[PDB]
Design a protein around this ligand. Structure first.
Ligand code: CLA
Ligand code: CLA
Ligand code: CLA
Ligand code: CLA
Ligand code: CLA
Ligand code: CLA
Ligand code: CLA
Ligand code: CLA
Ligand code: CLA
Ligand SMILES: CCCCCCCCCCCCO[C@H]1O[C@H](CO)[C@@H](O[C@H]2O[C@H](CO)[C@@H](O)[C@H](O)[C@H]2O)[C@H](O)[C@H]1O
Lengths: 166, 165, 95
C-alpha cells in the first residue's frame, strides 16, 4: 500500500559522503599546479617520513591502516539506523536534533537545515557536486595527458593529438 | 562472528551460557597445558642444558624386551583416552538445582529452574578472559601455523609480510 | 612401517565389548522379544530406542581390548601352554 518518496535516512547521506570525500579528494591534487613540478599518478607512496629505515616496502602501508578505519566506519552504521553521534552533522546535519521532518518518515521533497551559526551546508551543497563530477573529469582525461593551461603562445587552442585507442 | 547476536534456550543458551564455554574452560586449561608446554622458549637466556623426549632416539628406558609397538608415541597415547574418561563421565551425570533421581515434577515456578548448574556464579571475568584465550588460540597463533619451520632470529627492519605465499 | 596389528588390535578392541552378556543375568537375546512372531503393532512402525543405555561396561569390559591386545598380540600369544601336543599341536612362534 506504500505509494512514493520514502527512504528516510538512506542515501541523502551517501551524497554528502561522496562530495565531502570528493572535495577532500581533489585536495589530493591542488599541490602540483602553482608551483607545478611533481604530479600525475605518482604511485605516490604519499609524502614519506625521515631517512632512517624503509626502502620501498617496510610492509603494506594501508592494510594495517584500514583495520583502524573499520570500527570507526561501521559507526556511521552505528548511527544511520538509530541516530547517535553527539556532534550530529551528517545523518541529518547539526542544529542539535531537528530535521525529524525526515527522521520520522515522510520526506517527499524536504530540503532540510543546520548550523546554529548562520546558514547551512547549502553553498556547501554545490561545492559537493562540483567535486563529485570533478573527479569524473579528473580521472577522465588521464588515459590522455596530465596538465592544465598556460597562456597564448601555442597551448590553449588544441593542435594535434592521438585520440582513443581505435 | 558466530556470536553475532543470536540464541534462545536449549540450542541457543542452554548448551552454552556457561556449559559449552565452561567446557571451554577446558579449552583454556588445555591451552594452559599447551602453554605450560611451549614456554620452554618464552624466557630467553635460560639454563636448559639438555631428556624431555626429542626427535625419537630410543624412548623412556629402552625396555627389557622389545618396545611395545614402535616409537614413544603409542606408549603415552593409547592410555590417555581411557584414563581421563574419569572426568567427563562425572560431567555427564549432573543436573542444576537438586539431585535425587528422575523424580516427580520440576519444570518451572518462580526461582526459575536455575543457572548452568555451574553458572557464572558471578565472576563475569573468567569469560572476559575466556574468549580472549580463544581469540588468541584461533587468531595470530597463525603467526606460527602457516609455514612454521624456523625459530626466532630477528634482524631489524619493521614488521609484517602480506601476500606473498 | 605400518602398525597393521596397530588396528586389528583396535577392531577387536570393540567386538569383545562384544563378549558382553551370553553369560551374565538371564538367557540369550534378552530372550527373543519380538523377532519371530511380530511386534505389536508397533505399527507406524516401530520401537524401541533409548538414548539412555550406553553404560553397563563402559568401565568394566573396556579392559577387553588390553587382553589379547596386550601379552596376546605383539608379545607372543600364550607362552604358558602345554596341554596335549603330540597329534601334533605347536603352534610355534612365527614371531
Ligand atoms: C570498509 C568500511 C566499511 C565497513 C564501510 C561501510 C559503509 N560505507 Mg564506506 N567507505 C570506506 C570504508 C568502509 N565503509 C572507505 C575507505 C571509503 C573511502 C568509503 C566511502 C563511502 C561512501 C561515499 C559511502 C560509504 C557508505 C558506506 C555504508 C554503505 C556502509 C556502512 C555509503 C553510505 C556512502 O556514502 N562509504
Ligand atoms: C584532510 C585533508 C586533505 C588535506 C587538507 C590535504 C593536504 C595535503 N596533502 Mg593530502 N591527501 C588527502 C587529503 C588531504 N590532503 C587524501 C584523502 C589523500 C589520499 C589520496 C591524500 C594523499 C596525499 C599525498 C600522496 C600527498 C599529499 C600531500 C598533501 C600536502 C601537499 C604537499 C605538501 O607537502 O604541502 C605543502 C606544505 C606547506 C606547509 C605549504 C608551504 C607554507 C608553509 C610556510 C607552511 C598537503 C599538506 C603531499 C604531501 O606532501 O603530504 C602531506 C603528497 O605526498 N596528500
Ligand atoms: C550502548 C552503546 C553503543 C552504542 C551507542 C551502539 C550503537 C550501535 N550499535 Mg552497537 N555495540 C555496543 C555498544 C553500542 N552500540 C557494544 C558494547 C557491542 C558489543 C557487541 C555492540 C555490538 C554491536 C553489533 C554487532 C552491532 C551493533 C550495531 C550498532 C548500531 C545499530 C544499533 C543496534 O544494532 O542496536 C541493537 C538493538 C537492540 C534492540 C539489541 C537487542 C538486544 C537483545 C536483548 C535482543 C548502533 C549505531 C549494529 C551495527 O551498527 O551494524 C551495522 C550491529 O552491527 N553493535
Ligand atoms: C555515475 C556513474 C556512471 C556509472 C554507473 C558508471 C559505471 C562504470 N564506469 Mg564510468 N564514468 C562516468 C559515470 C558512470 N560510470 C562518468 C560521468 C565518467 C566521466 C565523467 C566516467 C568515466 C569512466 C572511465 C574512464 C571508466 C569508467 C568505467 C566504468 C565501469 C567500471 C566497471 C567496468 O569494468 O565497466 C564495464 C563496462 C561497461 C558496463 C560499458 C559501459 C561504458 C561506460 C559506462 C564506462 C562502470 C560500468 C571503466 C571501465 O573500464 O568501463 C569499460 C573506465 O574505463 N567510467
Ligand atoms: C574421548 C574422550 C571422551 C570419552 C570424551 C567425552 C566427552 N567429551 Mg571430550 N574431549 C577429549 C576426550 C574425550 N571426551 C579431549 C582429548 C578433548 C580436548 C576434549 C574436549 C571436550 C570439550 C570442549 C567438550 C567435551 C565434551 C565431551 C562430552 C560431550 C563427552 C562426555 C563436551 C562437554 C565439551 O564441553 N570434550
Ligand atoms: C612438555 C612440555 C614441557 C613440560 C616442556 C618443558 C620444557 N621445555 Mg619444551 N617443548 C614442548 C613441550 C614441553 N616442554 C614442545 C611441544 C615443543 C615444540 C617444545 C620446544 C622446546 C624448546 C626449543 C626448548 C624447550 C625447552 C623446555 C625447558 C625450558 C622445559 C624443560 C628449552 C630447553 C628449549 O627452549 N622446549
Ligand atoms: C572450590 C572452591 C572454593 C574456592 C577456592 C573459592 C574461592 C573464591 N570464591 Mg568461592 N565458592 C565455593 C568454593 C570456593 N570458592 C563454593 C563451594 C561456593 C558455593 C559453595 C562458593 C560461592 C562463592 C561466592 C558467592 C563467591 C565466591 C567468591 C570467591 C572468591 C573470593 C576470593 C577472595 O576472597 O579474594 C579476592 C574466591 C577466590 C566471591 C566472588 O565474587 O566470585 C565470583 C563470591 O561470589 N564464592
Ligand atoms: C588474532 C588476531 C588478530 C587480532 C585480533 C589482532 C590484534 C592485534 N594485533 Mg595483530 N596481526 C594479525 C591478526 C590479529 N591481530 C595478523 C594475521 C598479523 C600479520 C602477521 C598481525 C600483525 C600485527 C602487528 C605488527 C601488530 C599487531 C598488533 C595487534 C594489536 C594492536 C595494537 C593494540 O592492541 O593496542 C594496545 C595493545 C592487537 C591486539 C600490534 C602489536 O601487537 O604490537 C607490536 C602490532 O602492530 N598485529
Ligand atoms: C582488494 C584488495 C586487497 C588486494 C589488492 C588484495 C590482493 C590480493 N589478494 Mg587479497 N584479501 C584482501 C584484500 C586485498 N587483497 C582482503 C581484505 C582479504 C580478506 C580480508 C583478502 C584475503 C585474500 C586471500 C585469502 C588471498 C588473497 C590473495 C590476494 C592476491 C595475491 C596477490 C599477489 O600475487 O602478490 C604478488 C605481488 C605482485 C604480483 C605485485 C605486482 C592479491 C591479488 C591471494 C593471496 O593471498 O596470494 C596467495 C589469496 O587469494 N587475499
Ligand atoms: C492500499 C490497498 C490497495 C489498493 C487497491 C484497492 C483500491 C480500493 C477500491 C475501492 C473500493 C470501492 O470503492 C467504490 O466506491 C465509490 C463510492 O463509494 C464508487 O465511486 C463512484 O461514486 C461517486 C459518488 O459521487 C462518484 O463521485 C465517483 O466518481 C464514482 O467513482 C465506486 O464504486 C468505487 O470507487
Amino acid at each position: 500500500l506504500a505509494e512514493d518518496p520514502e527512504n528516510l535516512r538512506w542515501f541523502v547521506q551517501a551524497e554528502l559522503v561522496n562530495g565531502r570525500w570528493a572535495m577532500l579528494g581533489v585536495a589530493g591534487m591542488l599541490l602540483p599546479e602553482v608551483f607545478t613540478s611533481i604530479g600525475i599518478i605518482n604511485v605516490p607512496k604519499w609524502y614519506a617520513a625521515g631517512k632512517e629505515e624503509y626502502f620501498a616496502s617496510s610492509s603494506t602501508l594501508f592494510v594495517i591502516e584500514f583495520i583502524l578505519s573499520h570500527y570507526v566506519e561501521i559507526r556511521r552504521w552505528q548511527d544511520i539506523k538509530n541516530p547517535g553521534s553527539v556532534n550530529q552533522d551528517p545523518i541529518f546535519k547539526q542544529y542539535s536534533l531537528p530535521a525529524g521532518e525526515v527522521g520520522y518518515p515522510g520526506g517527499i521533497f524536504n530540503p532540510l537545515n543546520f548550523a546554529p551559526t548562520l546558514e547551512a551546508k547549502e553553498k556547501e551543497i554545490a561545492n559537493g557536486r562540483l567535486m563529485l563530477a570533478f573527479l569524473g573529469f579528473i580521472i577522465q582525461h588521464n588515459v590522455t595527458g596530465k596538465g592544465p593551461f598556460d597562456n597564448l603562445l601555442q597551448h590553449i587552442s588544441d593542435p594535434w593529438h592521438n585520440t582513443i585507442v581505435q | 562472528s558466530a556470536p553475532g547476536d543470536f540464541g534462545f534456550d536449549p540450542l541457543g543458551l542452554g548448551e552454552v551460557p556457561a556449559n559449552l564455554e565452561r567446557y571451554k574452560e577446558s579449552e583454556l586449561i588445555h591451552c594452559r597445558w599447551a602453554m605450560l608446554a611451549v614456554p620452554g622458549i618464552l624466557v630467553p637466556e635460560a639454563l636448559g642444558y639438555g631428556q624431555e623426549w626429542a626427535a625419537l632416539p630410543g624412548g623412556q628406558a629402552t625396555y627389557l624386551g622389545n618396545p611395545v609397538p614402535w616409537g614413544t608415541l603409542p606408549t603415552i597415547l593409547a592410555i590417555e583416552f581411557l584414563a581421563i574418561a574419569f572426568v567427563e563421565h562425572q560431567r555427564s551425570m549432573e543436573k542444576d538445582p537438586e539431585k535425587k533421581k528422575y523424580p516427580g515434577g520440576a519444570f518451572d515456578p518462580l526461582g526459575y529452574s536455575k543457572d548452568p548448574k555451574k553458572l557464572e556464579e558471578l565472576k563475569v571475568k573468567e569469560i572476559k578472559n575466556g574468549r580472549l584465550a580463544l581469540l588468541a588460540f584461533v587468531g595470530f597463533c597463525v603467526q606460527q601455523s602457516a609455514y612454521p619451520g624456523t625459530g626466532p632470529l630477528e634482524n631489524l627492519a619493521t614488521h609484517l609480510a602480506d601476500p606473498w605465499h | 612401517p605400518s602398525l597393521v596389528i596397530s588396528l586389528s588390535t583396535g577392531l577387536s578392541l570393540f567386538l569383545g565389548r562384544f563378549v558382553f552378556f551370553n553369560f551374565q543375568r538371564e538367557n540369550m537375546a534378552k530372550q527373543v522379544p519380538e523377532q519371530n512372531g511380530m511386534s505389536h503393532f508397533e505399527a507406524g512402525d516401530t520401537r524401541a530406542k533409548e538414548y539412555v543405555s550406553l553404560l553397563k561396561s563402559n568401565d568394566p569390559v573396556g579392559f577387553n581390548i588390553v587382553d589379547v591386545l596386550a601379552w596376546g598380540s605383539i608379545g607372543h600369544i600364550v607362552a604358558y601352554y602345554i596341554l596335549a601336543t603330540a597329534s601334533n599341536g605347536y603352534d610355534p612362534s612365527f614371531f
